[PDB]
Amino acid sequence: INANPGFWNGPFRYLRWSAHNRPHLFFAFAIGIAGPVAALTLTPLRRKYLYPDHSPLPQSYPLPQRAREQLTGFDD
Amino acid sequence: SSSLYRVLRNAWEVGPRSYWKQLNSIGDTKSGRLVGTDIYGNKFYETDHQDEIHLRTRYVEYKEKDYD
Amino acid sequence: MFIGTIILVLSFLGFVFNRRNIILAFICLETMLLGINLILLRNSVLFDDISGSLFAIVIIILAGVESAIGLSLLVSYYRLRGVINSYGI
Amino acid sequence: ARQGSFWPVTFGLACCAVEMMHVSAPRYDQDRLGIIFRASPRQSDIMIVAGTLTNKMAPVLRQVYDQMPEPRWVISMGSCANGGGYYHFSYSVVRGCDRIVPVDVYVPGCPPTSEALMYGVFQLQRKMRNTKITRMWYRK
Amino acid sequence: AIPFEALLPYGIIFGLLTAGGGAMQVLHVYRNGGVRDRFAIDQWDSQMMERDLRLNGGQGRKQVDQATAPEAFKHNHVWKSERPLI
Amino acid sequence: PREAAAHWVPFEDKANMPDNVPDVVEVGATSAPLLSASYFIGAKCKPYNDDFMLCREESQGSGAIDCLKEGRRVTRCAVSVIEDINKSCLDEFRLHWQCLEQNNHQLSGCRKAEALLNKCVFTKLNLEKKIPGLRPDEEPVFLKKDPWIKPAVDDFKSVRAYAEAKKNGTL
Amino acid sequence: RPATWEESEEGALSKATKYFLLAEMFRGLYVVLEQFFRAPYTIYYPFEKGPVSPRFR
Amino acid sequence: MIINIVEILIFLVCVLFSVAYLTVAERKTLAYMQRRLGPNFVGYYGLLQAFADAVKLLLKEIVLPKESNYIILVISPLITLITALIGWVVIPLGPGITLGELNLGILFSLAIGSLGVFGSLLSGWSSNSKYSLLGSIRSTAQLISYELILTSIFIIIIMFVSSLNITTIIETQRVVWYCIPLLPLLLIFFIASVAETARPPFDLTESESELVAGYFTEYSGSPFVFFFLAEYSNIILISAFNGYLLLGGYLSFNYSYLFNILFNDYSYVSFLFEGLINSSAYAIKLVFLMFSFIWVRAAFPRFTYDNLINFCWIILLPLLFGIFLIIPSTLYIFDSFPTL
Amino acid sequence: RIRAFTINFGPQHPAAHGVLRLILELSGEEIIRSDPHVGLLHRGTEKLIEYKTYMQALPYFDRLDYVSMMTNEQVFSLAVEKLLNVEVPLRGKYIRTMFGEITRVLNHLMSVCSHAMDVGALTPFLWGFEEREKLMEFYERVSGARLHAAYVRPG
Amino acid sequence: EVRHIELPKALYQAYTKATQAIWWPTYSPDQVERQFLSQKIDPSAKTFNDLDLTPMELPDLMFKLIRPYRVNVSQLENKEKTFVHILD
Amino acid sequence: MNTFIIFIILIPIVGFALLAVNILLAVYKPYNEKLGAFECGLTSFNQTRLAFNAAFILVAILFLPFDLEISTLLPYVMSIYLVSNYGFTIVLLFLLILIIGFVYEINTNALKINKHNKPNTDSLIYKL
Numbered sequence A: 001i002n003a004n005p006g007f008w009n010g011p012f013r014y015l016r017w018s019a020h021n022r023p024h025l026f027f028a029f030a031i032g033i034a035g036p037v038a039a040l041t042l043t044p045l046r047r048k049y050l051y052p053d054h055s056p057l058p059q060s061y062p063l064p065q066r067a068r069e070q071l072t073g074f075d076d
Numbered sequence B: 001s002s003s004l005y006r007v008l009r010n011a012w013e014v015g016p017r018s019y020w021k022q023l024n025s026i027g028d029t030k031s032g033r034l035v036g037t038d039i040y041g042n043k044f045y046e047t048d049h050q051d052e053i054h055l056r057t058r059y060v061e062y063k064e065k066d067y068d
Numbered sequence C: 001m002f003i004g005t006i007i008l009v010l011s012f013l014g015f016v017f018n019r020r021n022i023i024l025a026f027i028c029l030e031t032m033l034l035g036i037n038l039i040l041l042r043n044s045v046l047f048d049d050i051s052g053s054l055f056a057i058v059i060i061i062l063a064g065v066e067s068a069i070g071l072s073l074l075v076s077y078y079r080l081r082g083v084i085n086s087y088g089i
Numbered sequence D: 001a002r003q004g005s006f007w008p009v010t011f012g013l014a015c016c017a018v019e020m021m022h023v024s025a026p027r028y029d030q031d032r033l034g035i036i037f038r039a040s041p042r043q044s045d046i047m048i049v050a051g052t053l054t055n056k057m058a059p060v061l062r063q064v065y066d067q068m069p070e071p072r073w074v075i076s077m078g079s080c081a082n083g084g085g086y087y088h089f090s091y092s093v094v095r096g097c098d099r100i101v102p103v104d105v106y107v108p109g110c111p112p113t114s115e116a117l118m119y120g121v122f123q124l125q126r127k128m129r130n131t132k133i134t135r136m137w138y139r140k
Numbered sequence E: 001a002i003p004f005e006a007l008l009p010y011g012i013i014f015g016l017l018t019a020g021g022g023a024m025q026v027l028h029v030y031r032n033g034g035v036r037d038r039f040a041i042d043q044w045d046s047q048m049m050e051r052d053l054r055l056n057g058g059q060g061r062k063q064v065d066q067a068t069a070p071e072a073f074k075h076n077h078v079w080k081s082e083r084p085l086i
Numbered sequence F: 001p002r003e004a005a006a007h008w009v010p011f012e013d014k015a016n017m018p019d020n021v022p023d024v025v026e027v028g029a030t031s032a033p034l035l036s037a038s039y040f041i042g043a044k045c046k047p048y049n050d051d052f053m054l055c056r057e058e059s060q061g062s063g064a065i066d067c068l069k070e071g072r073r074v075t076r077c078a079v080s081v082i083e084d085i086n087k088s089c090l091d092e093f094r095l096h097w098q099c100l101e102q103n104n105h106q107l108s109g110c111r112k113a114e115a116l117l118n119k120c121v122f123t124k125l126n127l128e129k130k131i132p133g134l135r136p137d138e139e140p141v142f143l144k145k146d147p148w149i150k151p152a153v154d155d156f157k158s159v160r161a162y163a164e165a166k167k168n169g170t171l
Numbered sequence G: 001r002p003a004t005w006e007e008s009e010e011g012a013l014s015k016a017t018k019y020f021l022l023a024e025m026f027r028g029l030y031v032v033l034e035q036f037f038r039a040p041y042t043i044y045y046p047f048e049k050g051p052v053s054p055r056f057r
Numbered sequence H: 001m002i003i004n005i006v007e008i009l010i011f012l013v014c015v016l017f018s019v020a021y022l023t024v025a026e027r028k029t030l031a032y033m034q035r036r037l038g039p040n041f042v043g044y045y046g047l048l049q050a051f052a053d054a055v056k057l058l059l060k061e062i063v064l065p066k067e068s069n070y071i072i073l074v075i076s077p078l079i080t081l082i083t084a085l086i087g088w089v090v091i092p093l094g095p096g097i098t099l100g101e102l103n104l105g106i107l108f109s110l111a112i113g114s115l116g117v118f119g120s121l122l123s124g125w126s127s128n129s130k131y132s133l134l135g136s137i138r139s140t141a142q143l144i145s146y147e148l149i150l151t152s153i154f155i156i157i158i159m160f161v162s163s164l165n166i167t168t169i170i171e172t173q174r175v176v177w178y179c180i181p182l183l184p185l186l187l188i189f190f191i192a193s194v195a196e197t198a199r200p201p202f203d204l205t206e207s208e209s210e211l212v213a214g215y216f217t218e219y220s221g222s223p224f225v226f227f228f229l230a231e232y233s234n235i236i237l238i239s240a241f242n243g244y245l246l247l248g249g250y251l252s253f254n255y256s257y258l259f260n261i262l263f264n265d266y267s268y269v270s271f272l273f274e275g276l277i278n279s280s281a282y283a284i285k286l287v288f289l290m291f292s293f294i295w296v297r298a299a300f301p302r303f304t305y306d307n308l309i310n311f312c313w314i315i316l317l318p319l320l321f322g323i324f325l326i327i328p329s330t331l332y333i334f335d336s337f338p339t340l
Numbered sequence I: 001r002i003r004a005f006t007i008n009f010g011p012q013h014p015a016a017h018g019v020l021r022l023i024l025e026l027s028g029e030e031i032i033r034s035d036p037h038v039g040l041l042h043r044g045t046e047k048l049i050e051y052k053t054y055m056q057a058l059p060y061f062d063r064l065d066y067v068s069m070m071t072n073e074q075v076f077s078l079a080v081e082k083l084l085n086v087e088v089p090l091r092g093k094y095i096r097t098m099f100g101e102i103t104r105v106l107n108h109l110m111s112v113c114s115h116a117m118d119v120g121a122l123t124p125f126l127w128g129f130e131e132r133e134k135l136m137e138f139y140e141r142v143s144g145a146r147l148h149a150a151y152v153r154p155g
Numbered sequence J: 001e002v003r004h005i006e007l008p009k010a011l012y013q014a015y016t017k018a019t020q021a022i023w024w025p026t027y028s029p030d031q032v033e034r035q036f037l038s039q040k041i042d043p044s045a046k047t048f049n050d051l052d053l054t055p056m057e058l059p060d061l062m063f064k065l066i067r068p069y070r071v072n073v074s075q076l077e078n079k080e081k082t083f084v085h086i087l088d
Numbered sequence K: 001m002n003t004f005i006i007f008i009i010l011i012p013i014v015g016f017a018l019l020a021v022n023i024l025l026a027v028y029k030p031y032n033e034k035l036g037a038f039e040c041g042l043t044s045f046n047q048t049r050l051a052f053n054a055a056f057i058l059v060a061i062l063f064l065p066f067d068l069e070i071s072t073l074l075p076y077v078m079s080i081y082l083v084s085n086y087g088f089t090i091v092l093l094f095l096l097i098l099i100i101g102f103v104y105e106i107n108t109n110a111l112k113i114n115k116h117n118k119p120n121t122d123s124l125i126y127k128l
């Protein structure tokens, strides 16, 4: 009856055949590929219009990049 | 009827001593009118509560603990 | 490092002087790897160094894959003979 | 505990087994009393012989009975199991399962009704309830 | 109708878990001296609680907010002596 | 440094500091009051903390023994700020750190007490709480109204004091 | 003749919804749950008794 | 020490009695779904039924078949029960309210869980029957197959939290239970938990096999008790995994306003009340999941071995790998990687 | 050479219904040869009937397919009626048709629900056995027995 | 191999006397006493012979009597080669 | 001696106590017929190990690589923020590589037990 019509013969007919006759594989594949494609195509849009990326959190004591000043107070 | 309200109503109609007696013999709580008594001392009851299913409207309470 | 070293040496001797069955050889391989990982993890703790623990993790993953392949090889060997001799190799 | 956890292995030979099925059906609902039927004799306390026992079947029945862990009891259900019934004069029929296994209770009928079988189970429970176990050891 | 006898065992299970958890909460608070438990504590929190023990006299999780430490705080410092990991 | 392993014993040293080293007070607050005061300590003592850390870096291995005088300054500044808090804002400070003691030391569980503490410390000590590193677009979380994350039980005394301050007009 | 996939009235997304969300299994579970709120059939032998007729043997 | 002992006794009694009453609840619930009553006679309202079964079995003779490794057959059910009960040490009934407050609690759950296949594996070897070996092999294959599914869902959840502390995972769900954004994962986790406990409709081994009743066919007495207890204990424990991973554990609703009305300061009364509310929330979720196990038993016929292996490896696992891809992608797109 | 593995499916087995000894030969998963051994319920009924009068032999037919008692009775009655060259009256014919279809319902309840129980659908059995109880009351009210009615007879 | 231990009569008698305290039957102190007695047949007593009976032999009967407790190449390999061991 | 260690010791003790009670209270009367394996009431002959299908081997063997794949993601989920975008790309590449292997397994039909016997579909032809 229904049988694999070959992806390379016609792309959209094969995709329709898969969605009708192999839903588990077809939608597993759709969900799997949605992610990376969405990342590449949508993260810059989110940055431009929704909100920019957040400022980084400190990971250690933030050491000044300078020489030691002379200071005064709380002395012995 | 498996409802809690049926059990509460029958226990109220029947009284606590009868409630405990029934709970210790038959395990349900029935309320119905006495029809008569055995030569052996068993007592027989008929109920007309609409919450009682077909074949449950007649019942016996036995005279002795080792009922048979 | 004592426990790892003893485990490795005794497992190696069990592998070598095994004259009983082939499963003992598989087990001795697995436990030699365990002993090596124990030695490594103790040194990793004493240096407070992540490199030893990283290597130990990799060792665990490779031991899993090696077990899978070794047992596949054993099953393929069984397929033609139907039995494993106490020299089955 | 013996009365409340009453687990029979079914030797469901013949038409009597149908009545046994009706004991577990909603009207009588045997499991309301704690009765559960077990495939394995290892997990069973009661054997219920429900049907005609043929000569070809007799060693099989003895074997299933012997694999029951103790304590164990046997209920004979129906005329066939009780004494041979309608097939008593047959060349291929054991004349009562008590030629093969000891029997604790005999339930009459062809078949016994569901209520008759329940009555027999109650008789076995009465026998259980009157057993001396530690009192018997104390007598020794 | 709602079959209440079929709900009785579920009620027993629900009541047992509920009462056991309430009793456990009370026992934990009592073990803590009147405050809730600490959870998900890292190495920083562990060191802070040890320092707290040095400041409050070994009174568990008791807190003191006085600016200046007592004299004993200078000399009750602990180092740990760990056995050789052979 | 790693935590201790299989078998260890704690041991105390009974010696005194060498007499050449000038003596110093030690901070007497425990973890909850210190966490409550941490931002004010940072605000006031940033130059001394930075100098202490810079000394330690420049000593290149001998930092403990070479920065003792810088460390003395750091500890004196911390003691001074905690003393000021104990003199001017003790009730609100105690509200805040007792709330912290009930909420696993999570600042998100104590915003009402913290609001009073911040107002008191700003009005009587001129110290301000501020989170470094945010852009003007980014909003500091402690200033956020209607946060996603809320405590299981808003602290009783803190709720009452917050409502009272809102009546009085202080907050 | 049996119909092929391409001559189906339902689109593939509706069929996939039925397939992944177990529609008929959920209908079956609901039918079972409806029974849970109905009167049971059990009688309490030997305090109650099943029907008996004058012809009974 | 004393408080520790009291707390352990309370927790252990509650767990063991909950397991005992789950069997009664299954019998009653199946019964009413089948228009019958179930145990209503052993004890009042049939409330002593489980204890009658337990005493009966404790007085039943142990049989050791002739070709049997008797030690292995008596210790296999013992170890399955021991691991099954050890799993309870990390379940919290409120924030930090647990016997073991482990920063590696999720890892503990997974490791003790992976010790759960050895009962089926060793029970078949207990005898010298080829029927037994084949049945044990199939049951073991099903168990590890659905272990993969459960582990995958665990990892997917940890992607949102970045913590192995069970209390922390529960605490992050005060914003939303994880079953709301990941509802298909709720369905999949329940399906896999039923399969992992070898419950209907995933009960090949016991109900379509060469041996009449699974690999427990040869067990009588206390070993049978061990297997039965371990099974029901694992039902409740895997439901607790479901509860804390996806159902918000001990969280119900914000009772801050109500508590501020009721109480004016901290007391043992307010602490007891908060503990009761938290534990009751977790308990009611456990009750719904246990009811669902029984309901699914009531509604469906069994799979075959081939059907279930296909379901795990050809339908569920590819979806879970696709989800492995899509969850970090969504976190990246919106800049929502969780901190530690 | 393929070596079969041989299993006794039954008799003491839930699916084998207590009396079937199905000796199966499997190569791994698949059945290659099957050998049903029967006679575990061979009662010698056909030998017994030869020593009975026709009326005395009628109840043996109840006990052949012992969920379909009245149709078993019906086939024996129709055979004997054909040999006797007599005609059942009209009301009798209608009662036999009505109770034949009641018997068909009883049989199909047993068979479909037992089939479902074997695959693992446990609930249809309970639901259908209540209907069986209702119909067996009709059996008992016309014949005085729940199962072995001996109700349909030659004539 | 059946395990045999030899013990001093005093020690073993003490043990059997101690074990008589449990409720199930257990080796008697008097059975230990009898362990030092060998069978003594009356010179003047009727035997199996007077009943026209011939006792069976323990060695011939032991395997039958003890069957349930029993513990349990070159051509086999060559023969095994012809069979199938793994399938689809 | 916290609650964790005490609970873990206590569980096996209770198991052993129940076992001991059963040994102490139940009767013990082995005999030959009772000691037989239960196989539907009959006895079967001892047989050479059954020939098994390769899918039985393959499920268990393939469990280990897939299990290791899944468990290798634990360091990622415990470090996701720290490695954020670089590690996100790396973990995607790792997952895609493993998915290629899943594809191989699916397309080779590696876990399917094929029913060896199939209905005959040949036409019937007669040489007239």
Ligand code: SF4
Residues within 6 Å of the ligand: D014, D015, D016, D017, D050, D051, D052, D077, D078, D079, D080, D081, D085, D086, D109, D110, D111, D112, I063, I066
């Ligand atoms: S006694 Fe009657 S009903 Fe029972 S099996 Fe025999 S013939 Fe059938």
